[PDB]
Design a protein around this ligand. Structure first.
Ligand SMILES: [Mg+2]
Ligand SMILES: [Mg+2]
Ligand SMILES: [Mg+2]
Ligand SMILES: [Mg+2]
Ligand SMILES: [Mg+2]
Ligand SMILES: [Mg+2]
Ligand SMILES: [Mg+2]
Ligand SMILES: [Mg+2]
Ligand SMILES: [Mg+2]
Ligand SMILES: [Mg+2]
Ligand SMILES: [Mg+2]
Ligand SMILES: [Mg+2]
Ligand SMILES: [Mg+2]
Ligand SMILES: [Mg+2]
Ligand SMILES: [Mg+2]
Ligand SMILES: [Mg+2]
Ligand SMILES: [Mg+2]
Ligand SMILES: [Mg+2]
Ligand SMILES: [Mg+2]
Ligand SMILES: [Mg+2]
Ligand SMILES: [Mg+2]
Ligand SMILES: [Mg+2]
Ligand SMILES: [Mg+2]
Ligand SMILES: [Mg+2]
Ligand SMILES: [Mg+2]
Ligand SMILES: [Mg+2]
Ligand SMILES: [Mg+2]
Ligand SMILES: [Mg+2]
Ligand SMILES: [Mg+2]
Ligand SMILES: [Mg+2]
Ligand SMILES: [Mg+2]
Ligand SMILES: [Mg+2]
Ligand SMILES: [Mg+2]
Ligand SMILES: [Mg+2]
Ligand SMILES: [Mg+2]
Ligand SMILES: [Mg+2]
Ligand SMILES: [Mg+2]
Ligand SMILES: [Mg+2]
Ligand SMILES: [Mg+2]
Ligand SMILES: [Mg+2]
Ligand SMILES: [Mg+2]
Ligand SMILES: [Mg+2]
Ligand SMILES: [Mg+2]
Ligand SMILES: [Mg+2]
Ligand SMILES: [Mg+2]
Ligand SMILES: [Mg+2]
Ligand SMILES: [Mg+2]
Ligand SMILES: [Mg+2]
Ligand SMILES: [Mg+2]
Ligand SMILES: [Mg+2]
Ligand SMILES: [Mg+2]
Ligand SMILES: [Mg+2]
Ligand SMILES: [Mg+2]
Ligand SMILES: [Mg+2]
Ligand SMILES: [Mg+2]
Ligand SMILES: [Mg+2]
Ligand SMILES: [Mg+2]
Ligand SMILES: [Mg+2]
Ligand SMILES: [Mg+2]
Ligand SMILES: [Mg+2]
Ligand SMILES: [Mg+2]
Ligand SMILES: [Mg+2]
Ligand SMILES: [Mg+2]
Ligand SMILES: [Mg+2]
Ligand SMILES: [Mg+2]
Ligand SMILES: [Mg+2]
Ligand SMILES: [Mg+2]
Ligand SMILES: [Mg+2]
Ligand SMILES: [Mg+2]
Ligand SMILES: [Mg+2]
Ligand SMILES: [Mg+2]
Ligand SMILES: [Mg+2]
Ligand SMILES: [Mg+2]
Ligand SMILES: [Mg+2]
Ligand SMILES: [Mg+2]
Ligand SMILES: [Mg+2]
Ligand SMILES: [Mg+2]
Ligand SMILES: [Mg+2]
Ligand SMILES: [Mg+2]
Ligand SMILES: [Mg+2]
Ligand SMILES: [Mg+2]
Ligand SMILES: [Mg+2]
Ligand SMILES: [Mg+2]
Ligand SMILES: [Mg+2]
Ligand SMILES: [Mg+2]
Ligand SMILES: [Mg+2]
Ligand SMILES: [Mg+2]
Ligand SMILES: [Mg+2]
Ligand SMILES: [Mg+2]
Ligand SMILES: [Mg+2]
Ligand SMILES: [Mg+2]
Ligand SMILES: [Mg+2]
Ligand SMILES: [Mg+2]
Ligand SMILES: [Mg+2]
Ligand SMILES: [Mg+2]
Ligand SMILES: [Mg+2]
Ligand SMILES: [Mg+2]
Ligand SMILES: [Mg+2]
Ligand SMILES: [Mg+2]
Ligand SMILES: [Mg+2]
Ligand SMILES: [Mg+2]
Ligand SMILES: [Mg+2]
Ligand SMILES: [Mg+2]
Ligand SMILES: [Mg+2]
Ligand SMILES: [Mg+2]
Ligand SMILES: [Mg+2]
Ligand SMILES: [Mg+2]
Ligand SMILES: [Mg+2]
Ligand SMILES: [Mg+2]
Ligand SMILES: [Mg+2]
Ligand SMILES: [Mg+2]
Ligand SMILES: [Mg+2]
Ligand SMILES: [Mg+2]
Ligand SMILES: [Mg+2]
Ligand SMILES: [Mg+2]
Ligand SMILES: [Mg+2]
Ligand SMILES: [Mg+2]
Ligand SMILES: [Mg+2]
Ligand SMILES: [Mg+2]
Ligand SMILES: [Mg+2]
Ligand SMILES: [Mg+2]
Ligand SMILES: [Mg+2]
Ligand SMILES: [Mg+2]
Ligand SMILES: [Mg+2]
Ligand SMILES: [Mg+2]
Ligand SMILES: [Mg+2]
Ligand SMILES: [Mg+2]
Ligand SMILES: [Mg+2]
Ligand SMILES: [Mg+2]
Ligand SMILES: [Mg+2]
Ligand SMILES: [Mg+2]
Ligand SMILES: [Mg+2]
Ligand SMILES: [Mg+2]
Ligand SMILES: [Mg+2]
Ligand SMILES: [Mg+2]
Ligand SMILES: [Mg+2]
Ligand SMILES: [Mg+2]
Ligand SMILES: [Mg+2]
Ligand SMILES: [Mg+2]
Ligand SMILES: [Mg+2]
Ligand SMILES: [Mg+2]
Ligand SMILES: [Mg+2]
Ligand SMILES: [Mg+2]
Ligand SMILES: [Mg+2]
Ligand SMILES: [Mg+2]
Ligand SMILES: [Mg+2]
Ligand SMILES: [Mg+2]
Ligand SMILES: [Mg+2]
Ligand SMILES: [Mg+2]
Ligand SMILES: [Mg+2]
Ligand SMILES: [Mg+2]
Ligand SMILES: [Mg+2]
Ligand SMILES: [Mg+2]
Ligand SMILES: [Mg+2]
Ligand SMILES: [Mg+2]
Ligand SMILES: [Mg+2]
Ligand SMILES: [Mg+2]
Ligand SMILES: [Mg+2]
Ligand SMILES: [Mg+2]
Ligand SMILES: [Mg+2]
Ligand SMILES: [Mg+2]
Ligand SMILES: [Mg+2]
Ligand SMILES: [Mg+2]
Ligand SMILES: [Mg+2]
Ligand SMILES: [Mg+2]
Ligand SMILES: [Mg+2]
Ligand SMILES: [Mg+2]
Ligand SMILES: [Mg+2]
Ligand SMILES: [Mg+2]
Ligand SMILES: [Mg+2]
Ligand SMILES: [Mg+2]
Ligand SMILES: [Mg+2]
Ligand SMILES: [Mg+2]
Ligand SMILES: [Mg+2]
Ligand SMILES: [Mg+2]
Ligand SMILES: [Mg+2]
Ligand SMILES: [Mg+2]
Ligand SMILES: [Mg+2]
Ligand SMILES: [Mg+2]
Ligand SMILES: [Mg+2]
Ligand SMILES: [Mg+2]
Ligand SMILES: [Mg+2]
Ligand SMILES: [Mg+2]
Ligand SMILES: [Mg+2]
Ligand SMILES: [Mg+2]
Ligand SMILES: [Mg+2]
Ligand SMILES: [Mg+2]
Ligand SMILES: [Mg+2]
Ligand SMILES: [Mg+2]
Ligand SMILES: [Mg+2]
Ligand SMILES: [Mg+2]
Ligand SMILES: [Mg+2]
Ligand SMILES: [Mg+2]
Ligand SMILES: [Mg+2]
Ligand SMILES: [Mg+2]
Ligand SMILES: [Mg+2]
Ligand SMILES: [Mg+2]
Ligand SMILES: [Mg+2]
Ligand SMILES: [Mg+2]
Ligand SMILES: [Mg+2]
Ligand SMILES: [Mg+2]
Ligand SMILES: [Mg+2]
Ligand SMILES: [Mg+2]
Ligand SMILES: [Mg+2]
Ligand SMILES: [Mg+2]
Ligand SMILES: [Mg+2]
Ligand SMILES: [Mg+2]
Ligand SMILES: [Mg+2]
Ligand SMILES: [Mg+2]
Ligand SMILES: [Mg+2]
Ligand SMILES: [Mg+2]
Ligand SMILES: [Mg+2]
Ligand SMILES: [Mg+2]
Ligand SMILES: [Mg+2]
Ligand SMILES: [Mg+2]
Ligand SMILES: [Mg+2]
Ligand SMILES: [Mg+2]
Ligand SMILES: [Mg+2]
Ligand SMILES: [Mg+2]
Ligand SMILES: [Mg+2]
Ligand SMILES: [Mg+2]
Ligand SMILES: [Mg+2]
Ligand SMILES: [Mg+2]
Ligand SMILES: [Mg+2]
Ligand SMILES: [Mg+2]
Ligand SMILES: [Mg+2]
Ligand SMILES: [Mg+2]
Ligand SMILES: [Mg+2]
Ligand SMILES: [Mg+2]
Ligand SMILES: [Mg+2]
Ligand SMILES: [Mg+2]
Ligand SMILES: [Mg+2]
Ligand SMILES: [Mg+2]
Ligand SMILES: [Mg+2]
Ligand SMILES: [Mg+2]
Ligand SMILES: [Mg+2]
Ligand SMILES: [Mg+2]
Ligand SMILES: [Mg+2]
Ligand SMILES: [Mg+2]
Ligand SMILES: [Mg+2]
Ligand SMILES: [Mg+2]
Ligand SMILES: [Mg+2]
Ligand SMILES: [Mg+2]
Ligand SMILES: [Mg+2]
Ligand SMILES: [Mg+2]
Ligand SMILES: [Mg+2]
Ligand SMILES: [Mg+2]
Ligand SMILES: [Mg+2]
Lengths: 272, 45
RNA sequence: CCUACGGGCAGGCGCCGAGGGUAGGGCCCGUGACUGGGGCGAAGUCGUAACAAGGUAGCUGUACCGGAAGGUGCGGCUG
RNA sequence: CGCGGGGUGGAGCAGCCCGGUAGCUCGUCGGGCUCAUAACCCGAAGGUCGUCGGUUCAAAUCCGGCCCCCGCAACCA
RNA sequence: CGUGGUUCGUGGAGCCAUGGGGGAAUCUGGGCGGACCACCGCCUAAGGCUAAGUACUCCGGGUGACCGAUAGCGCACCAGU
RNA sequence: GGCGAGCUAGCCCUGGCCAGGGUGAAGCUGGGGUGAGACCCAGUGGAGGCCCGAACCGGUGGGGGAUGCAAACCCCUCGGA
RNA sequence: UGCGAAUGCCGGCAUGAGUAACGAUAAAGAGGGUGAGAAUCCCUCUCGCCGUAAGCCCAAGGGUUCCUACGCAAUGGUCGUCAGCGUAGGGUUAGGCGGGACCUAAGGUGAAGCCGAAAGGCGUAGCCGAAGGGCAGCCGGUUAAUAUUCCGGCCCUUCCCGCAGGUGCGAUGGGGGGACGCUCUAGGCUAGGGGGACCGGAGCCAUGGACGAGCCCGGCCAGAAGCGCAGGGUGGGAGGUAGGCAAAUCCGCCUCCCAACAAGCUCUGCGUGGUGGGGAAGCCCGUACGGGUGACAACCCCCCGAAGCCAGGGAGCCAAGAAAAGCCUCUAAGCACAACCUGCGGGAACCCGUACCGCAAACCGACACAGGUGGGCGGGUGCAAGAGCACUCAGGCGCGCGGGAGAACCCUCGCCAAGGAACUCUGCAAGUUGGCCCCGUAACUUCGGGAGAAGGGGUGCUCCCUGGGGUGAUGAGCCCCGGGGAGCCGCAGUGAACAGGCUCUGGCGACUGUUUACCAAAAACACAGCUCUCUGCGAACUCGUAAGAGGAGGUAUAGGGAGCGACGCUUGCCCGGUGCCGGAAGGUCAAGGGGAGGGGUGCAAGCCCCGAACCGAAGCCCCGGUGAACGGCGGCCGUAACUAUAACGGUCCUAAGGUAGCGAAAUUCCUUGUCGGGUAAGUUCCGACCUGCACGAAAAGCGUAACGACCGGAGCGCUGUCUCGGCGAGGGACCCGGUGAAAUUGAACUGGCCGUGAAGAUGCGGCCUACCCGUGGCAGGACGAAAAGACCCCGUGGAGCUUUACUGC
RNA sequence: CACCUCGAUGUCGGCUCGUCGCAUCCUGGGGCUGAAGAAGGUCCCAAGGGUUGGGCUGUUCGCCCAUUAAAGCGGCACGCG
């Protein structure tokens, strides 16, 4: 769980790489069920609209299955576990008895060989998807839907998961990775287990280059600019903020809440 | 050292050519203007 | 050069070689602006920590804090 | 030389604006409690208000001059 | 209610237009005469067309107290070269 | 109101390039070690914004040039590779 | 309608001036020829320079520059008979090369559809889009000039028709395949190269020797099928089937049974192959280039050997590495006297490019410009290797002014006695060092480093003996790593060329990286990493009027914003003010509601206008919280049994009065503080003290190994830096022939002193000095040139930037 | 102070090259002395010539080391880009 290196170069001294033992025989990444070509692109129609992106290794997309109700009843065999560059979590290749193949975001524990399945039926065991209402209160789940039939959206990042805290009406109360207490419709599919590859949070990029491989170009502080182009640029030399800390566009960036208040979603939430 | 002019037949046509001029409303005016002035060449050769 | 000459001596070269030189290490001693605590010194300053529930039982390993003794936390010992 | 502030019992601070009244803590002195000291309690004394002028009926107070005190300023060069 | 137009810059601010809200009547119905009311008058909104008198000069011609090759059009000449 | 990313900056798609030498990570195999281990040793192995240095990319110090060979150049030197 | 001025405008001609220059210091010399004319054109001979080029081949760009004849006014930095120049004529040949009647990539365009005052913006399919995918030509000959294009030889593709043989044929649809990274790398080949005592070949014996296993030259290229050698790809059969938006017999999944190997099948590379073709030196021809002979040329062995080929080869690794068509399979309509598949035969096969330059005199730089320009080839020997360095092959060049001379001075070089940093802001500069092998190597450390630490020894040639490996048969030969021994020569053996000076000690930044294109490369930016904060997903945020899009085909181990900046030990107190966060109360508050009451006009019903109470958001007030939020973090006085100092005390104020650590510092004013160290001497440097004008904890505090073309201090080494200069070399300067600029310029017949003058006089006064005109030199003056001062002020001139300035959006 | 110069009179220090003044640092000649001698003190004459090398700092200056007959002051656009 996490590789170290001997300091045979600086930066290698602190550099740390993911363990890839979980990766069942793998390298080629299963054409057909994905990949699709993924359009590396750092702007919209012309203009940069997210700073400091671009470059970094080319990458093939894996079209994964964020709606398991797609094949209720039909069981599948876990054929493989493989590396997916487009996400922190790792993916499992599912061989359905239909002869259909699909990638699922691999949960912790999921071993190659297991049968897996989705539906109101379905044995509450890691890898299986069900509508939320039919899941035992207190069970930890992942890849949750937020509205019935709209595909999984919550708890998918490596290591994450939601907890089921109780039910009330057509909804059940989830505790999301953020710590928020959310009502979600009971018909929304989730899948038992936590996400897995939870040592992800413990890698140390080690050097600037590494950030670059991940498509992350250097980020420059407002402090290092001029008044023309940031609320923090100017002085002679070093200089405190001399105002409440701001973003390039003028807004405050320390505590100033930003969620739209009158959002209809408001009456389905209750936490941090 | 490397100067500013770096000739490239395709770029030139793609940028100043007749067809490119006819797409933009602004371009169509460049033609209108040159045609009215009596230019012998409405577009780079 | 000498013969008692298929030799000896002078003389030449080589080895090692006292030591001198260049360079880098190791141990010990002396000394140094300044700095750390320590001991000792008839009658200096500040408090009162301990000895009698020592007037907050005490001591204790650790940790933080405070002019100072010390105080507090955690656990321990009863002396 | 500039600008602002300040000088009041032995110490440190009020009162100066809005003229007529000098007030606070500490200290000092006398007496209590103690075997004694300190703490504590009861009493008390002590200042012309930096200085020299002027205004006023009257000046710590309002005005001007000198003397010090604190702080800021002294940039293009 | 919010604006534009008119000489009208919110003014006593009508008139004409209209983005928003409300929302009629058919001659005894409606609009206007500078807030508003009365009176007295003018005129018939929410469909459309309509010559001529008017503007201009790429073009043709006629004229000049207009230029005469550094002038006159940038070009009298193969110049928008 | 238009013209410009054929210079320059960033990004996107598709190709190309980096003489030669050095250092010798993990892993692996073996031996030792232990109750089992950690671990040690040898070989093997060939990692790295690792080392030296051409191409290539630079532009550090000095000299020259200054109506220049040059509206940024030349020589020596130097950085990355 | 009158010009002398406007750093006026257009034009012409002057001055500087026969002056600077004539564009890389790779270099020239003679003979012959041509011609009106020759250093400059042609030819020969000699000399020099490039050779990972300064040679050759592509791609861009250029667009007649190409070959030939005639020619020299201009262009050519001189000349010109010459030319890339003037005139004319000629020259570019493709089913197989490149591109198009193929494919898709970013992106572009865009039926449907969405949005926008108009213009127009978006957008699924589709279409366009290439140096990527797909796709059939190799060798040689020929022209003044084109050639994989013409030709010769051998070989191949598609399309149409027909014949035969085979099969359910049939697509834009289903499936497979195409199909993919980086580093390292095996086997076998090829290109390429070396050697040969072997094969072929004109000749050669000089100058002392050599007729010799001598010298010199050459010893190949292409090639179907078949055949070998080496590799790539691939399991076969059966049953079940609900998945691959219809249907599949195909693919997927399951079961069973046979191979598990490349066996077989298939594809590629290389060898061989019918035949075809090339074929040196030297000599002879005339060139302006080529042509004859050599020739019935020979045409073979050995060795080195790729980064290229077999190719979709193998291993490892993480950052996880296009698409679509061709192709194959599957079935659907449909058709199955169709159709498709195989073989053979006959016919058919279009458009564009093709000259020449292409690291450059033909491209980008106003120039025949010392700059810039992407891909491939790039031989030999030596040097550890190499594309490095020296010389050299093929090939190509001497750079389009020359001849002299031998000053100063300048540039680029070489050497220097004694000294050796005394130079200077500084060892700036230069020198020293320098490759390989061996011995050897400290503090400290994050255990990797520091290390090429430092400091040393070896280094050539000759003979003798000897180990191991590759290729061959184990063998010889050839090639490759060595080892031991005895000797030879010089001042010197990496004998030339390419090739670190070293150490000690501070500051800043952890580090590799990034930057002010053209005065700053840094202690600035970035960086892994730490913290705060926002964001539940139609996320926040960003772009846009919108649609839409980025975020992300991501989902809190994620994304945005901010500060800090590896790592180590740490990061204190203040929430009074400002920000942000929380607070269903209360205060205030707009439109609106509400209307108590009032007013205008009517005879009146009425019409019309004001208008209190009270009910009405956010915001603000108010109550709280919050420090890796903006920020802030005290004054006077006294006191100890020498003195001094003050652990202690009094009092005033605050939201709280600066903790650790550090400190004359990238911070210290006084200041060269004081003391110690270094030095003969130290305003700097190092250590320390603390009186911190005016350090102090994520605008982080204090340290830290390694790292640095950063900045400081010291020493050793070595020196022309210096005492202090000297000599020498070459390119200029100078003279002669050719060509011939420039800024500047009121006109000039343009001297010194002491005065005077708008206060610094060639130009005025007095006196002094002084025949007329040049050339080489120096730079004191002409308030010398250049630029309508950038500093300063002024203008109710401008512009970028800020904020609790104003007012808006 | 603001008179020439803002359609430009380049600014400290060093280097180089000097030239001039004398109110003389040394050497020469003097008077006086509280001048025994030697050595000084002070004033007068005198500008011919001479007036060192180093450490520190950008420094001028100054401090210091080692010498010296002496380690002189000033002007020349604080002489001289
Ligand atoms: Mg666009
Ligand atoms: Mg992390
Ligand atoms: Mg940053
Ligand atoms: Mg900046
Ligand atoms: Mg901008
Ligand atoms: Mg701003
Ligand atoms: Mg700021
Ligand atoms: Mg600052
Ligand atoms: Mg370049
Ligand atoms: Mg051009
Ligand atoms: Mg140009
Ligand atoms: Mg092109
Ligand atoms: Mg139109
Ligand atoms: Mg025409
Ligand atoms: Mg020793
Ligand atoms: Mg001591
Ligand atoms: Mg002591
Ligand atoms: Mg006690
Ligand atoms: Mg106690
Ligand atoms: Mg007690
Ligand atoms: Mg006790
Ligand atoms: Mg304790
Ligand atoms: Mg303490
Ligand atoms: Mg205290
Ligand atoms: Mg306890
Ligand atoms: Mg007092
Ligand atoms: Mg009063
Ligand atoms: Mg009292
Ligand atoms: Mg008393
Ligand atoms: Mg007074
Ligand atoms: Mg008085
Ligand atoms: Mg200023
Ligand atoms: Mg109006
Ligand atoms: Mg008004
Ligand atoms: Mg108006
Ligand atoms: Mg009316
Ligand atoms: Mg309306
Ligand atoms: Mg009516
Ligand atoms: Mg009317
Ligand atoms: Mg009317
Ligand atoms: Mg009508
Ligand atoms: Mg009408
Ligand atoms: Mg009409
Ligand atoms: Mg008219
Ligand atoms: Mg006309
Ligand atoms: Mg006339
Ligand atoms: Mg004319
Ligand atoms: Mg004219
Ligand atoms: Mg005329
Ligand atoms: Mg006209
Ligand atoms: Mg004209
Ligand atoms: Mg014409
Ligand atoms: Mg560009
Ligand atoms: Mg290359
Ligand atoms: Mg590579
Ligand atoms: Mg290597
Ligand atoms: Mg073992
Ligand atoms: Mg090894
Ligand atoms: Mg190993
Ligand atoms: Mg090895
Ligand atoms: Mg490297
Ligand atoms: Mg390096
Ligand atoms: Mg280096
Ligand atoms: Mg290097
Ligand atoms: Mg340079
Ligand atoms: Mg620079
Ligand atoms: Mg220079
Ligand atoms: Mg220079
Ligand atoms: Mg180098
Ligand atoms: Mg280099
Ligand atoms: Mg005139
Ligand atoms: Mg005049
Ligand atoms: Mg002259
Ligand atoms: Mg001359
Ligand atoms: Mg000349
Ligand atoms: Mg020459
Ligand atoms: Mg020639
Ligand atoms: Mg010739
Ligand atoms: Mg072309
Ligand atoms: Mg021509
Ligand atoms: Mg020609
Ligand atoms: Mg001719
Ligand atoms: Mg001519
Ligand atoms: Mg000529
Ligand atoms: Mg020329
Ligand atoms: Mg002739
Ligand atoms: Mg011609
Ligand atoms: Mg070709
Ligand atoms: Mg083609
Ligand atoms: Mg056709
Ligand atoms: Mg096409
Ligand atoms: Mg297409
Ligand atoms: Mg439209
Ligand atoms: Mg569009
Ligand atoms: Mg599109
Ligand atoms: Mg291609
Ligand atoms: Mg391919
Ligand atoms: Mg082709
Ligand atoms: Mg040929
Ligand atoms: Mg040719
Ligand atoms: Mg042919
Ligand atoms: Mg048939
Ligand atoms: Mg059928
Ligand atoms: Mg397909
Ligand atoms: Mg190989
Ligand atoms: Mg060959
Ligand atoms: Mg060969
Ligand atoms: Mg022979
Ligand atoms: Mg013969
Ligand atoms: Mg002879
Ligand atoms: Mg013979
Ligand atoms: Mg031979
Ligand atoms: Mg041979
Ligand atoms: Mg060959
Ligand atoms: Mg062959
Ligand atoms: Mg099978
Ligand atoms: Mg099947
Ligand atoms: Mg189906
Ligand atoms: Mg089959
Ligand atoms: Mg095989
Ligand atoms: Mg072959
Ligand atoms: Mg064959
Ligand atoms: Mg033959
Ligand atoms: Mg033949
Ligand atoms: Mg021949
Ligand atoms: Mg000819
Ligand atoms: Mg492979
Ligand atoms: Mg298609
Ligand atoms: Mg079929
Ligand atoms: Mg045929
Ligand atoms: Mg051609
Ligand atoms: Mg050609
Ligand atoms: Mg060529
Ligand atoms: Mg070049
Ligand atoms: Mg080049
Ligand atoms: Mg090239
Ligand atoms: Mg060439
Ligand atoms: Mg040429
Ligand atoms: Mg030339
Ligand atoms: Mg050139
Ligand atoms: Mg050119
Ligand atoms: Mg260059
Ligand atoms: Mg080669
Ligand atoms: Mg070579
Ligand atoms: Mg040799
Ligand atoms: Mg070498
Ligand atoms: Mg070379
Ligand atoms: Mg040659
Ligand atoms: Mg020549
Ligand atoms: Mg030349
Ligand atoms: Mg030499
Ligand atoms: Mg010397
Ligand atoms: Mg010597
Ligand atoms: Mg020495
Ligand atoms: Mg000196
Ligand atoms: Mg010195
Ligand atoms: Mg310096
Ligand atoms: Mg230094
Ligand atoms: Mg140097
Ligand atoms: Mg030498
Ligand atoms: Mg050197
Ligand atoms: Mg060693
Ligand atoms: Mg080491
Ligand atoms: Mg060190
Ligand atoms: Mg060494
Ligand atoms: Mg050595
Ligand atoms: Mg020798
Ligand atoms: Mg062998
Ligand atoms: Mg071999
Ligand atoms: Mg052998
Ligand atoms: Mg030997
Ligand atoms: Mg020797
Ligand atoms: Mg070196
Ligand atoms: Mg320090
Ligand atoms: Mg750095
Ligand atoms: Mg760069
Ligand atoms: Mg750069
Ligand atoms: Mg720059
Ligand atoms: Mg600039
Ligand atoms: Mg989106
Ligand atoms: Mg997306
Ligand atoms: Mg964040
Ligand atoms: Mg920073
Ligand atoms: Mg820092
Ligand atoms: Mg703090
Ligand atoms: Mg406190
Ligand atoms: Mg606060
Ligand atoms: Mg608060
Ligand atoms: Mg607050
Ligand atoms: Mg609030
Ligand atoms: Mg309220
Ligand atoms: Mg109201
Ligand atoms: Mg109302
Ligand atoms: Mg009424
Ligand atoms: Mg209210
Ligand atoms: Mg407030
Ligand atoms: Mg309360
Ligand atoms: Mg005392
Ligand atoms: Mg005593
Ligand atoms: Mg006493
Ligand atoms: Mg105290
Ligand atoms: Mg402080
Ligand atoms: Mg402190
Ligand atoms: Mg300390
Ligand atoms: Mg100091
Ligand atoms: Mg400071
Ligand atoms: Mg000393
Ligand atoms: Mg000292
Ligand atoms: Mg300094
Ligand atoms: Mg001060
Ligand atoms: Mg600071
Ligand atoms: Mg601070
Ligand atoms: Mg802070
Ligand atoms: Mg520090
Ligand atoms: Mg660096
Ligand atoms: Mg540096
Ligand atoms: Mg020194
Ligand atoms: Mg010299
Ligand atoms: Mg010479
Ligand atoms: Mg001449
Ligand atoms: Mg004269
Ligand atoms: Mg005068
Ligand atoms: Mg006169
Ligand atoms: Mg005169
Ligand atoms: Mg004369
Ligand atoms: Mg002269
Ligand atoms: Mg002069
Ligand atoms: Mg001169
Ligand atoms: Mg001037
Ligand atoms: Mg001016
Ligand atoms: Mg203004
Ligand atoms: Mg004046
Ligand atoms: Mg005046
Ligand atoms: Mg002037
Ligand atoms: Mg005198
Ligand atoms: Mg005197
Ligand atoms: Mg005397
Ligand atoms: Mg005397
Ligand atoms: Mg005497
Ligand atoms: Mg110095
Ligand atoms: Mg002096
Ligand atoms: Mg001084
Ligand atoms: Mg002087
Ligand atoms: Mg002065
Ligand atoms: Mg002076
Ligand atoms: Mg001066
Ligand atoms: Mg200068
Ligand atoms: Mg100067």
């Amino acid at each position: 769980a996490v590789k170290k290196f001997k300091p045979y170069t600086p930066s290698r001294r602190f550099m740390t790489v993911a363990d890839f033992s979980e990766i069942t025989k793998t390298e080629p990444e299963k054409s057909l069920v994905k990949p699709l070509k993924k359009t590396g692109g750092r702007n919209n129609q012309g203009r940069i609209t997210v700073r400091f992106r671009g470059g970094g290794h080319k990458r093939l997309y894996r079209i994964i299955d964020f709606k398991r109700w797609d094949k209720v009843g039909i069981p599948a065999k876990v054929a493989a576990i493989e590396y997916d560059p487009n996400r922190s979590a790792r993916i499992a290749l599912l061989h359905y008895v239909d002869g259909e193949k699909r990638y699922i975001i691999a949960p912790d524990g999921l071993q190659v060989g297991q049968q897996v399945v989705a539906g109101p039926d379905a044995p509450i065991q890691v890898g299986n998807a069900l509508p939320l209402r039919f899941i035992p209160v207190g069970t930890v789940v992942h890849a949750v839907e937020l509205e019935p039939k709209k595909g999984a959206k919550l708890a998918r990042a490596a290591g994450t998961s939601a907890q089921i805290q109780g039910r009330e009406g057509d909804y059940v109360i989830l505790r999301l990775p953020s710590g928020e207490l959310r009502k979600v419709h009971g018909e929304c599919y989730a899948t038992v287990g936590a996400v897995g590859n939870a040592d992800h949070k413990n890698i140390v990029l080690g050097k600037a280059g590494r950030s670059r491989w991940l498509g992350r170009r250097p980020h420059v502080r407002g402090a290092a600019m001029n008044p023309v182009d940031h609320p923090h640029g100017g002085g002679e030399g070093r200089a405190p903020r001399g105002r409440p800390p701001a973003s390039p566009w003028g807004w405050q960036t320390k505590g100033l809440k930003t969620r739209k208040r009158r959002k209809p979603s408001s009456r389905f939430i209750i936490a941090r | 050292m490397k100067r500013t002019w770096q000739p490239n037949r395709r770029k030139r046509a793609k940028t100043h050519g007749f067809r490119a001029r006819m797409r933009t409303p602004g371009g169509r005016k460049v033609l209108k203007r040159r045609r009215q002035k009596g230019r012998w060449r409405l577009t780079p050769a």
